[PDB]
Amino acid sequence: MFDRAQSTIANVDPEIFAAIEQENRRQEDHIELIASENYTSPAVMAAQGSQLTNKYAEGYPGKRYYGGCEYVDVVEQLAIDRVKQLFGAEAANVQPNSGSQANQGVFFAMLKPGDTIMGMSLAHGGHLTHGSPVNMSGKWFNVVSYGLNENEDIDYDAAEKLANEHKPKLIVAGASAFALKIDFERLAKIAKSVGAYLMVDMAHYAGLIAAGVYPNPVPHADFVTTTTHKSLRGPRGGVILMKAEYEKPINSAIFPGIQGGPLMHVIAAKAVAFKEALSPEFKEYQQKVVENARVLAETLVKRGLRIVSGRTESHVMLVDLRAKHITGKAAEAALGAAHITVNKNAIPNDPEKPFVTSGIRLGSPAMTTRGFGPAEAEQVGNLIADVLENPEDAATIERVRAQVAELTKRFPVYR
Amino acid sequence: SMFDRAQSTIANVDPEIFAAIEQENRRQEDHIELIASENYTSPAVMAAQGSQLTNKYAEGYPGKRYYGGCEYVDVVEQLAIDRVKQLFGAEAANVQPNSGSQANQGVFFAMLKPGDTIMGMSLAHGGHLTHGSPVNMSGKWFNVVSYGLNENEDIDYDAAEKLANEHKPKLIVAGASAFALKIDFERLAKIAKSVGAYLMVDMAHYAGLIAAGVYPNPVPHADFVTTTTHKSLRGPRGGVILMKAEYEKPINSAIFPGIQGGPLMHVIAAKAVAFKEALSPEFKEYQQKVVENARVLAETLVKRGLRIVSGRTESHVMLVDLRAKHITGKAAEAALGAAHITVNKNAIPNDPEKPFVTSGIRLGSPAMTTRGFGPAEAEQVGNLIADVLENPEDAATIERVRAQVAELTKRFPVYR
Ligand SMILES: *Cc1c(COP(=O)(O)O)cnc(C)c1O
Ligand SMILES: *Cc1c(COP(=O)(O)O)cnc(C)c1O
């Protein structure tokens, strides 16, 4: 059971082996445009497959409850130091188990149940964790939301009025389906004017920010949270960045507040991902992410679709499908049949029900990771439009699927 | 390239992290681990969590996902669910919790509101941080009443019953991180029912023993049973909630969209592997050995003049009262560590020492048993520990024990 020769997934658990093999193949054989998805490196995966899963290391480097933490301390401190370097942060906590736990760490440190918070409207591109009434963020706190103006940019003037009316203890900024640069400096001014903390959840944009191709919230915010996966291209998990004055409450909130033993193998994987993100090659990658998203958007507009906000300045776009008389749900299904993975998403003032929608969200991080360039981004844009224009036509779906197969064979994810 | 498995190795990409991992692998070999919450998980479990399943966003549940493309991760998660239900006889399960802490928090988010009253076992008497500490969520946002041990150092069920009637808790937590005896879950369920409270049993420490049928199963008696997948269950690091079917909907909703986002599908694959291992006859043999080795270790320490809190062990764990040897828990932990025996200090009931000093150490057998120790080695270990406790500052003693420990760790490698 503990011989690495005999204890292989195939020998121990053939069913789980088979499912993993089919998932490996599924990742190769579909073009992934879900904007929150990426492919992480073999080195990152190897780190989280390590024996570091065996170590209980409650506490912090040099300040652990148990002995024997000399080497996991080196690992965690490298992760902290590198993520501080990436974002210019005064302090960091690399223990959060997920983006959700990173956000909850800030809330636990700084708020009490019933306190008022502001966040971006879910209907307008905010995330579940930014105040949904079925998420902790909204169930146990009093939430006021701000959204977009008529031009489909953030309505900063409206946000300012709401902040003055409701006096939130904390303002959340960031989004999961918003294509433009967010004015973090302006949001910091608004927060300061009412005595609120500013927390920026940069999960979608963190990789772009690390590469300098999207604005950095760190100089402006009290707290910045993120996933380590998504555009940062790391393992699944979370990070809190914070001003030095908040180092003690934040660290205390993560442990012993809301977590126990950190996942040290995942933290090793975070450290590896941060080393990758510090490299010149990562900056080139993110430049390509931005270019590919722009080209994809441009192509869809040429084919008669509309981009919410009118343009992208990031990795992501929300496509208004109404000109093609197809719902987001129907588009997602037809594209999936053609081996293009997207997700439905409501648009501002969507006429359709919430599980139907009039939009799809698309992002470039994953296709860019597997090597697509602008010529491929354009091809993909045209293949999408081909499906949208005849979504139930077997021949169309088959033609697109065949073209997708040529692309996925030419651009394998893992070698 | 950055995505060529030939070139993207830890050693090539991140030599500093590679070096630290190699040193940790060596550290695991070279010490005898007696921390009762520690174990060594299998190469197959590690391989699963090193897989490409880390790339998949799979918010929601099997067949009920937000995104497409979840056919294969659905197979994985449902296998995990089915196997853990089979292991414990549970009516329903949620295998998404990121940790034991998140498993507990899922139950609280589902069933309680801030300010509600809960009961849990006293931390001073063997309860866990997550059972109501004022600096943990469990205690900061809820009103906590604790119950503890009687004069015999067993749970004072009569006192727990009186407290439940006085305080009318919405939910009673049972389970412990430093308690050696069988807990009477049936009795606690009667107490909870009598005041209309939910019973949640946090079985993290005991879960592997329970799966093997060598410690009592709380599942027939509790509304909710939470656990880690690591510790005695010997899986990857993460959590599980087991629940009566009538609570399936609130529990699942509480985990997602309530307190988590995308599940860690690679870790869930690793959980499924660990559960398959736990279903095997070899795992039952392992847990029988865990119980035997803990008993032998305890017996040996008693022969050498130490005392076991509660007077005996009925599980994988023991709390050793060190007072007869005039040594603190802190001092014992340090001296043993110098001799390559890893333990942790722990307060005893009515400890005369300050909280970071203590009069006890906690010891457990899961890890040493995993690497192949039997009763002869458990007895040797007991004697080596006593040798150190009797002369903790004596260089010759520490060195002699270290040499003996090195013979044992070379004989019983963790990974081959
Ligand atoms: C995906 C996401 C999260 C949650 O991350 P999980 O690791 O899925 O818990 C939080 N915030 C934002 C903006 C996200 O996009
Ligand atoms: C270790 C433990 C936990 C916490 O598990 P983590 O995975 O470290 O969050 C909860 N309850 C008990 C009884 C434990 O022993």
Side-chain angles (χ1 to χ4, degrees), chain A residues 1-2 4-5 7-24 26-111 113-149 151-160 162-188 190-301 303-354 356-405 407-408 410-414, chain B residues 1-25 27-112 114-150 152-161 163-167 169 171-189 191-192 194-399 401-409 411-415:
Chain A
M1 293 193 65
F2 285 74
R4 295 181 176 284
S7 185
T8 193
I9 306 176
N11 285 341
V12 174
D13 195 341
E15 292 166 290
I16 288 290
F17 170 77
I20 295 171
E21 295 292 290
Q22 291 192 277
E23 177 59 16
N24 293 347
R26 196 202 59 78
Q27 290 180 18
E28 296 296 335
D29 290 351
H30 295 69
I31 293 174
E32 180 61 81
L33 306 177
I34 290 178
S36 58
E37 295 283 53
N38 214 332
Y39 309 108
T40 200
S41 74
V44 167
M45 289 185 283
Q48 60 183 8
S50 70
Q51 293 175 217
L52 274 56
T53 193
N54 297 327
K55 190 62 176 110
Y56 239 108
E58 292 165 303
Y60 292 95
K63 301 178 189 293
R64 300 280 188 201
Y65 287 87
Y66 298 167
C69 291
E70 54 265 38
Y71 310 114
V72 297
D73 285 3
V74 170
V75 169
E76 186 170 350
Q77 196 65 49
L78 281 167
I80 292 167
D81 290 350
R82 293 167 181 177
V83 80
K84 287 173 58 180
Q85 186 185 349
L86 275 170
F87 295 103
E90 295 185 354
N93 185 305
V94 298
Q95 300 192 14
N97 291 328
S98 64
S100 293
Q101 268 74 71
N103 292 1
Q104 290 159 14
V106 177
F107 277 37
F108 189 82
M110 308 313 297
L111 306 176
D115 283 347
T116 297
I117 65 162
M118 273 182 75
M120 197 177 181
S121 153
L122 175 62
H124 282 189
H127 194 258
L128 184 75
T129 61
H130 301 170
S132 166
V134 297
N135 183 254
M136 200 160 76
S137 63
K139 194 181 164 188
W140 287 355
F141 301 89
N142 179 53
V143 180
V144 174
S145 299
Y146 62 92
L148 308 180
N149 59 25
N151 202 38
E152 297 170 338
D153 199 350
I154 289 169
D155 194 341
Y156 297 98
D157 289 351
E160 182 162 0
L162 286 170
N164 277 282
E165 175 62 25
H166 296 282
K167 297 305 244 281
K169 188 146 149 179
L170 178 149
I171 297 176
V172 180
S176 50
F178 180 63
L180 308 181
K181 291 183 290 183
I182 296 164
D183 194 338
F184 302 122
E185 190 174 0
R186 178 135 176 39
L187 288 163
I190 290 168
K192 189 195 176 70
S193 76
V194 299
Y197 302 113
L198 176 69
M199 176 180 127
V200 175
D201 180 352
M202 69 168 177
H204 261 261
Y205 312 101
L208 288 70
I209 290 162
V213 301
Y214 187 93
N216 190 346
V218 167
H220 307 290
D222 297 294
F223 314 100
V224 176
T225 59
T226 190
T227 53
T228 49
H229 55 292
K230 311 190 180 186
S231 66
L232 200 47
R233 204 162 67 176
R236 293 200 168 253
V239 165
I240 304 166
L241 308 178
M242 62 285 194
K243 297 279 168 68
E245 64 182 303
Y246 304 122
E247 180 182 10
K248 287 185 188 162
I250 290 292
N251 284 335
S252 294
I254 288 294
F255 177 84
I258 68 164
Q259 296 189 176
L263 305 178
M264 295 308 316
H265 50 304
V266 182
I267 291 170
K270 294 178 184 173
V272 174
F274 303 156
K275 175 100 187 296
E276 292 180 7
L278 284 164
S279 75
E281 290 79 7
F282 191 85
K283 182 174 175 181
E284 177 170 359
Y285 162 60
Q286 295 295 351
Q287 287 173 322
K288 290 179 185 163
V289 164
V290 169
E291 181 61 24
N292 285 343
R294 190 189 47 80
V295 171
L296 175 55
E298 173 178 66
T299 305
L300 290 167
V301 171
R303 295 292 296 272
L305 288 306
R306 189 185 80 83
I307 307 297
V308 175
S309 310
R311 68 187 191 277
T312 180
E313 297 178 332
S314 66
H315 65 303
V316 69
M317 65 207 77
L318 181 52
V319 183
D320 175 355
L321 300 164
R322 289 178 289 179
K324 308 297 186 186
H325 310 111
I326 189 176
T327 63
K329 179 178 168 62
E332 177 180 329
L335 288 162
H339 285 228
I340 301 170
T341 312
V342 308
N343 70 262
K344 71 194 167 180
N345 201 106
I347 65 174
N349 306 312
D350 203 310
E352 303 285 350
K353 284 162 186 289
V356 175
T357 86
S358 298
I360 52 179
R361 185 187 62 183
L362 307 176
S364 62
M367 74 175 184
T368 307
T369 289
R370 70 189 296 166
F372 285 21
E376 293 76 35
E378 187 172 3
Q379 195 180 168
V380 167
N382 282 312
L383 294 174
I384 291 167
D386 292 345
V387 173
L388 297 178
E389 286 179 340
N390 217 351
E392 294 176 3
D393 185 66
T396 299
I397 298 302
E398 172 59 13
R399 270 186 322 272
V400 173
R401 187 193 284 113
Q403 286 164 108
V404 169
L407 280 165
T408 60
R410 334 207 329 250
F411 294 99
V413 185
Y414 296 102
Chain B
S1 94
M2 295 191 67
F3 286 74
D4 181 334
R5 295 181 176 284
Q7 303 309 325
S8 183
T9 68
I10 307 175
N12 286 337
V13 173
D14 196 342
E16 291 165 302
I17 290 290
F18 172 76
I21 294 171
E22 296 292 289
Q23 292 188 282
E24 175 60 18
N25 293 345
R27 195 202 63 76
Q28 289 179 22
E29 295 295 338
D30 288 354
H31 299 256
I32 293 174
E33 181 60 81
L34 306 177
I35 292 178
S37 57
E38 296 282 52
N39 213 335
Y40 310 108
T41 200
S42 74
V45 167
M46 290 185 283
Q49 59 181 10
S51 72
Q52 293 175 217
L53 277 55
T54 192
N55 296 329
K56 189 62 175 110
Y57 240 109
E59 291 166 307
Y61 291 96
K64 302 180 180 74
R65 300 280 188 200
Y66 275 25
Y67 297 167
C70 291
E71 169 166 15
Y72 309 118
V73 296
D74 284 4
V75 169
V76 170
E77 184 170 351
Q78 196 62 235
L79 281 168
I81 292 166
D82 290 350
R83 293 166 180 176
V84 79
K85 287 172 57 180
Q86 185 184 350
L87 274 171
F88 294 102
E91 296 186 354
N94 184 309
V95 298
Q96 298 193 12
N98 290 330
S99 65
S101 294
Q102 267 73 72
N104 291 2
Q105 290 158 15
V107 177
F108 277 37
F109 188 82
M111 307 314 297
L112 306 177
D116 282 348
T117 297
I118 64 164
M119 275 181 72
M121 195 176 181
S122 152
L123 175 63
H125 282 189
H128 194 256
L129 183 76
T130 61
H131 301 170
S133 166
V135 297
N136 184 252
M137 200 161 78
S138 62
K140 194 180 165 187
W141 289 353
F142 302 87
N143 179 51
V144 180
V145 173
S146 88
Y147 60 91
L149 309 181
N150 61 22
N152 284 350
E153 296 172 337
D154 196 352
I155 289 169
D156 193 343
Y157 295 98
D158 288 350
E161 181 160 3
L163 287 169
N165 278 283
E166 177 176 14
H167 296 281
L171 178 149
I172 296 175
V173 182
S177 50
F179 181 64
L181 306 183
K182 291 182 291 182
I183 296 164
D184 193 340
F185 302 123
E186 190 174 359
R187 178 133 178 227
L188 288 164
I191 290 168
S194 78
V195 299
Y198 300 112
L199 176 69
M200 175 180 128
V201 175
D202 180 353
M203 69 167 177
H205 261 261
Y206 311 102
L209 286 69
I210 291 163
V214 303
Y215 187 92
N217 191 346
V219 165
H221 308 291
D223 299 292
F224 314 99
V225 177
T226 59
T227 191
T228 53
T229 50
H230 57 292
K231 311 190 181 181
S232 67
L233 198 48
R234 204 162 66 177
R237 207 157 275 280
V240 166
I241 304 166
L242 308 180
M243 63 287 194
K244 289 198 178 290
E246 63 180 304
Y247 306 123
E248 181 178 350
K249 287 186 191 305
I251 291 292
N252 285 336
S253 293
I255 287 295
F256 176 83
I259 68 164
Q260 296 188 176
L264 304 179
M265 294 308 316
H266 51 305
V267 181
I268 291 169
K271 293 177 184 174
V273 176
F275 302 156
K276 175 98 182 293
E277 291 181 6
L279 283 165
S280 74
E282 288 80 9
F283 190 86
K284 183 168 185 12
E285 177 169 359
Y286 162 62
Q287 295 294 353
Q288 287 174 320
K289 290 178 185 163
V290 165
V291 170
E292 167 178 52
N293 287 344
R295 189 182 33 72
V296 171
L297 176 55
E299 289 170 354
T300 304
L301 292 166
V302 170
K303 287 173 183 168
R304 295 293 296 275
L306 287 307
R307 189 185 79 85
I308 306 299
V309 175
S310 309
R312 65 190 192 275
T313 180
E314 298 176 334
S315 66
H316 63 302
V317 69
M318 66 209 74
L319 181 53
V320 186
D321 175 356
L322 299 164
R323 290 178 289 180
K325 306 298 184 185
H326 309 278
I327 187 177
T328 64
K330 178 178 168 62
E333 179 179 329
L336 288 162
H340 284 232
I341 302 170
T342 312
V343 309
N344 70 262
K345 70 194 168 180
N346 199 291
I348 66 175
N350 305 311
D351 203 311
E353 304 285 351
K354 284 161 187 289
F356 301 139
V357 175
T358 85
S359 300
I361 53 180
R362 186 187 61 182
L363 308 175
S365 61
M368 74 176 184
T369 307
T370 288
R371 70 191 296 169
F373 285 19
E377 292 76 33
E379 186 171 357
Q380 194 181 168
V381 169
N383 280 314
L384 292 174
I385 290 167
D387 291 344
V388 174
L389 298 176
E390 286 179 338
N391 220 347
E393 297 167 7
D394 183 68
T397 299
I398 298 304
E399 173 57 17
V401 173
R402 185 209 59 76
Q404 285 164 107
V405 169
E407 294 197 349
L408 279 166
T409 61
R411 279 177 58 209
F412 294 98
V414 185
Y415 296 105

